[PDB]
Amino acid sequence: MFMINILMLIIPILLAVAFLTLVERKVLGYMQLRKGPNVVGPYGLLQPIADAIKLFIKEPLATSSASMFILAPIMALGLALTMWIPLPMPYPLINMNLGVLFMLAMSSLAVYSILWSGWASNSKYALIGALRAVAQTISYEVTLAIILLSVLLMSGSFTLSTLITTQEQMWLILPAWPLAMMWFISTLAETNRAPFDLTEGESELAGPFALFFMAEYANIIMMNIFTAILFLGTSHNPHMPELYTINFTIKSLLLTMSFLWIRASYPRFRYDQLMHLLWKNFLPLTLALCMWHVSLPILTSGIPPQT
């Protein structure tokens, strides 16, 4: 029974990633006064399938270390799917008492796939590009962890389903919209999304490729699902759980679509400029707001329950 449940999560995640590539292309297209894919299947609905087949029968074009060349994509894709197993939608696949910490711990491991693939590139210049990407990723891990802790001081625990209870009456975006703003931007920078897509930017100044792409786009969906739960909590009715799933899916779709919207709207940061955005802007505010959110429940007598 449990193995069926795992597959009813793994398979839809990969299908959702496939069709996000179509949605991204069509949303970007219409914001650019054009259409995007509309020939390969009606309204382009077969475009992800054609792309997927094409990439997997392409020539799989020497690695500096075979073990790490293969480890990096397995790590990326395996970790990406793992981040989904504690998500309450409304019931998690695995109900963890410390689910928020688990997601923080697993996400911190994702930078190894960047590091390992840079080592296996066998090229001095690709290793340097990987190290620049790693420095960006760990920099924005700092604010994400501190922002998350600030929010949990209103929730009371590290259990993800408690965020639902915390937002029974009101979305956490209202008491914490300054944190929501930096959290949202931090996720963009964390996933190397525009205007923080410096790996693809700086770089230009088959199956293995597809696998890394699936991992990244799964992370994009997951981060926006996490954002919906963290700040736009949906109400759970235990006798009609599908009502929660519909409302929570719509919010996650809209948050994901706003990632595309933002890509279509702005130029790119310089590397040093996105480092200053973190170390000189977000981190000072995040630290001050962390002190504020430690004090606020105490001074209002609004400390949440431990359980």
Binding site: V23, K26, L45, Y91, P241, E242, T249
Partner: protein, 69 residues
């Protein structure tokens, strides 16, 4: 037109609806039609293990009421 973007969004939305809807219905099927019991702390695990013994069939989700008194 922009509403030709919807079919791809609909497929994506149905793909993301399946995990949550499947988990909830699998939980009811496996737990006698009720929510799966949450036991994050030793006290809740102790009650669940006592429920298993009291059930008479080794299922913590099979409940005995005043009929057993």
């Amino acid at each position: 037109m922009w509403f030709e973007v919807l079919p791809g969004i609909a497929v994506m939305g149905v793909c993301l609806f399946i995990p949550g809807m499947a988990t909830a219905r699998i939980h009811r099927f496996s737990n006698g039609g009720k929510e799966k019991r949450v036991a994050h702390y030793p006290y809740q695990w102790y009650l669940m293990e006592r429920d298993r013994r009291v059930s008479g069939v080794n299922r913590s989700y099979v409940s005995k009421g005043l009929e057993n008194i």
